Amino acid sequence: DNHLLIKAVQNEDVDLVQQLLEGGANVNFQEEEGGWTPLHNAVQMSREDIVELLLRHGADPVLRKKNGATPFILAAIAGSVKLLKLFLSKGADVNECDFYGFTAFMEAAVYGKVKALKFLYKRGANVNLRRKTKEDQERLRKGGATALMDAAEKGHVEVLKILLDEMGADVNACDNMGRNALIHALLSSDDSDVEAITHLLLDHGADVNVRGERGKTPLILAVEKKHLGLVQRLLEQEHIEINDTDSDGKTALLLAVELKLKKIAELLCKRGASTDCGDLVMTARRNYDHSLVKVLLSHGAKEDFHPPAEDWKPQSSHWGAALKDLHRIYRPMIGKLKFFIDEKYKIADTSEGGIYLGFYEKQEVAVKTFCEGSPRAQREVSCLQSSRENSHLVTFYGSESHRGHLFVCVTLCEQTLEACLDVHRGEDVENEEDEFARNVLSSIFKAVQELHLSCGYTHQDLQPQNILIDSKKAAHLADFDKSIKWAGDPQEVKRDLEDLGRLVLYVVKKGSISFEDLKAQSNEEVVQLSPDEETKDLIHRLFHPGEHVRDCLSDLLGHPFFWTWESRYRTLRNVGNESDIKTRKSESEILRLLQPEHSKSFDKWTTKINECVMKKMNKFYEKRGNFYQNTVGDLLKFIRNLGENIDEEKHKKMKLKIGDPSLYFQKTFPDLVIYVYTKLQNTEYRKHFPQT
Amino acid sequence: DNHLLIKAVQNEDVDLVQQLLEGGANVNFQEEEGGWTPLHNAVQMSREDIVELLLRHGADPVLRKKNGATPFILAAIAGSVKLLKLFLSKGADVNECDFYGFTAFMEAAVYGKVKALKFLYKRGANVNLRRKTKEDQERLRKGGATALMDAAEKGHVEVLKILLDEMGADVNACDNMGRNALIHALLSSDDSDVEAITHLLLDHGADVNVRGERGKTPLILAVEKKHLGLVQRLLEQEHIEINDTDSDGKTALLLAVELKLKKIAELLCKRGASTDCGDLVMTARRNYDHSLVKVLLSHGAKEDFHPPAEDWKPQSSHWGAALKDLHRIYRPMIGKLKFFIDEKYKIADTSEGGIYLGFYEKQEVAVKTFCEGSPRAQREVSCLQSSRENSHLVTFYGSESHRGHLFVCVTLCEQTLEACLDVHRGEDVENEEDEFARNVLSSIFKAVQELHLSCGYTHQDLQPQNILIDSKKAAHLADFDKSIKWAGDPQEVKRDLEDLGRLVLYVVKKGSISFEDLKAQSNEEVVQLSPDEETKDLIHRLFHPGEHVRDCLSDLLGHPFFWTWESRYRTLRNVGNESDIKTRKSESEILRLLQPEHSKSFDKWTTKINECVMKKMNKFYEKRGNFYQNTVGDLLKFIRNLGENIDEEKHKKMKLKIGDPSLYFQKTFPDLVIYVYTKLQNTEYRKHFPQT
């Protein structure tokens, strides 16, 4: 309803425009996006009749839009001398500029409007103004361009002749980047008139030895354009610096050779380019150009190139032998990525290619290949792009496309979970505490947690092959080409969770059971298959999360499974250290909680004990006859008591008969650690639990 | 010494070659890089005399190099009919191919050798072979190309005529990517003869409706080439699909409009392209092309474009109000980055521009700007590239270059450390435990640690402004444009360390002291300035690391400073629970360690206590008269004793008079926690310490 007038002007519906304005429409309304008024639109369309009509209804002739452009400036873009004349009589100044420093003279040059350019010059426009813009952009070295530069960049030949021959434009003016008009023409993608423009500028004394945005000289730009005529004209300049190098340290000749340009490369050689630019001869051979090889040799090129003394050692131990080779051999670069699809550097075969060693930004990485369009390709990439903040995932370095082939670069690891615990299974013939199982599973839990909640994705392929191991040896989640977005559907989250539970049994059993048949048996057989009670209750919780399935992963990180043996020990002694349990009380809140489940390990625990240690502990209460009884409370009283004095110096006898105390109590009563946890799980008696 | 013969051949020094071969030189030597033999080099140079000479000295005529190429195949690349004839008589098969599936016929087409092509055809070469390569590349959809495709891609016009008119080549053959010869010519960067090639193929019945590597049709490719003639010829095909979209969903007309091609866009419109491709009219207006606007309107283009219903909420709370706007408004894309250098989206000014809001891969990020060449630009980028595995650093999304301006994209945070603890200072009027100080400093310590040791860089600008805070509120390290590589020079590592110590005082004091004058006073005044003893000893260690300065950051993570109050409490009670300390022993190893330092807090601690609580505790030993004495051991005995019974149910009197026990003991004796740590720092009595 507020846009009616702007839209009427835009449709050039004069009758409707008249009707709206006479109806009471806001003539100076500004649309939110760019601050455009009906007048701005009328001028842009170069419709002087609509402009007049709007002005007579009280349109502000000098009202700027958001970029600071005036109707006068827009008139130059349109090329309307009539509208320029009009606004100059309405208070516009000929040298006024927008917030980016664009004057009307510049816009006429940009858009190639000759009549407007000529008119503005005679109305007193300044030809050699360098664009002044915000201090913001100026620190970037933005701004500083001129009208001559604009006409060059856009390739307006007639405008350029007029600027140089009739209007006294400074040919060698430079912007804040240091670019002159010659550089601007050669940088431009509008190549249509670049030959004429170049000759024109050079004949007017334009400087050939001036740098662009990447060390690029005019000569280097002509070489990269593969333009023989440009190179020929540029090389006629008696003082051109042929041996200048861009930001990559590459010279014009080297670039000519790499770009397979024999005629240009030979020309540079005849005009006296040095042949110590880099791998000159060997590059020509690799491109199978002996004609170019012979030319380079006669002009004195070196015959064995030893690259700069780059200090480099591979970080990987498993690879690295291969990495040293890949680092040494020649390879064409794909963007930032250097790699070779070859059996020597393949680490694994995959559905759309394989995984390969590579260097992403001089950094050693693993490279996953895809057919660029495939569903797998864009499931992996889409997931990796949305999960950069996930610390437990394999970190995403970047990707490169080549010819419909996607190369996803990713942190390089040593081996999979399978390969790792194959070795760990052969050495751990002991009944030893499995620290590795804990800090690997806790690491993977955090990956799936942030994946679901922070990244908003579901993995859908939790398996040992997809968990990679550092050289440290930390664990990381990987392979995402089977990921799905919205976790809203609980069946997808459930699918990931009951894959996690089957994975918990895998690591604890040290991989003796293959993951493929672990997925074959039900999630009820897998629970009954778990060795200790701590994993038994852990994977059971993963198969039956509470009302909020969301919270049910942070909670599990505080499960007895993740507790060390000393931690299980310390807290059992801490609960047994309750005053209500030593002075057994009927009304105790803690004692009624611990009361039962007919089948348990500790129902009559005083018989389960040795019991020569038992009688030696019972002697402490022989006076009042307060012996230990078969309650859950007195077992914890016993554990707190035993572990306390077992450090004193009259108890070496008890040390031998019990062995490690934290280990012994768990053996004879495996049911205990989980039982006390399930009970006190939501009480004030949780301070006894260890921190995380 | 083994390369003499290869080098002699490469120099075309026949006399030297003769001399070497007659001397006993290995005629079939293969250089390590590519498996090149003297024969391979002789053929590549197309020197039949050297080839003969080598063969007469026993050169294997069919020995392949590493890519599987034979001397026969190399002869086709050279275009030598004589050498092809020679090797065919020496056992080479006309249809033999390298390991990538290249035949001699194909190479002659690739390199445009007409005499060789004609010769090979008459010697029975198969014209229509599709390249067979390794199963590796084939899963990528590599391979499958033909000789016709090669000649098209390289732009050999005469070769193409011969293949189609004289040799019966399948014009509509497709490779494993689905590309035919027409698509290959239009994809090529060798545009020199693309007009002639296109007409030739189309006249021979080439299919126009076939997809390239990015959904690109021949028509879309011609439009992107800005080639009016190509578009004209392609549009003469009576059944071309004008409305096909590439992988971005962009049609040929839309691309023509975005590329500012009025004549092409009008042609597509006249040939009946639909005008519901996207933001057609509005794109033409933004480019100030009313002529194109009028054309699009007459052909029925929509006048208000509402983008697809992309569900999106900003993640940030501080920003996000601005992010919603930046997400909504139009902006030209710089690579992957969408952002606006404008005051509304600026978050901070900097030396070479500022920091701005932006979207890197549809992901909200902070954008840091640089002049691309500057030392600051390549100090930031070089550091960020080498530290992607650092979890505690600000994560590096990527960078885009535009016109000599570098835009470094990086994870977006809420505020700096200063801005955060300004608010925390106004609310924490309590003598409360500062949890925030701990988990922020421990997080920053880990950043500097991995920076120095894992990333191999020194920060050189540790300050509150450079520590950013999450919305969670986690801490992250940032700003790297003052980083230096090799940490070998200890003065650079020291400089970072004594910046860390001054930072520890900053956070603990809640930022009441500005960081700038903290750097003004000496690192000896800063130590004496620290409030509690735990920070006093912490920043002192940072100013005087041991022999190995390297280890001296992991060690500090186990300092009492990082211990919670309960943790300081628990371990003091644990040490006091030693049997040697309750039954005070002369020969005790622990008791002699704890013995002194004339000035301390606990020298005569029994007077420092209340002492109504003291006398109530001394009543426990009134029988044998074993009262507490002013040793360090009995103080810990007291702490272990008090904290033990203070939970029992006859001690509410002691709870009031002491308050929080973990807090009270630290008040009256601030010296204690650090003293016991310094003592037991390297003993078996470290089990009492808390884990990490």
Ligand SMILES: Nc1ncnc2c1ncn2[C@@H]1O[C@H](COP(=O)(O)OP(=O)(O)O)[C@@H](O)[C@H]1O
């Ligand atoms: N970053 C890496 N470091 C080491 N090995 C890797 C890496 N990425 C993949 N691999 C290896 O490649 C195999 C397959 O890669 P993956 O991403 O699982 O592909 P797919 O989706 O076909 O399973 C993995 O099982 C693993 O052995």
Ligand SMILES: Nc1ncnc2c1ncn2[C@@H]1O[C@H](COP(=O)(O)OP(=O)(O)O)[C@@H](O)[C@H]1O
């Ligand atoms: N990722 C980010 N999130 C939020 N704020 C940022 C981020 N990066 C930089 N800033 C803000 O910009 C300021 C300057 O950026 P910085 O990288 O320190 O540049 P300089 O090298 O000029 O100090 C910082 O103090 C901080 O306030």
Ligand SMILES: [Mg+2]
């Ligand atoms: Mg997999």
Ligand SMILES: [Mg+2]
């Ligand atoms: Mg997969």
Ligand SMILES: [Mg+2]
């Ligand atoms: Mg800074």
Ligand SMILES: [Mg+2]
């Ligand atoms: Mg800085």
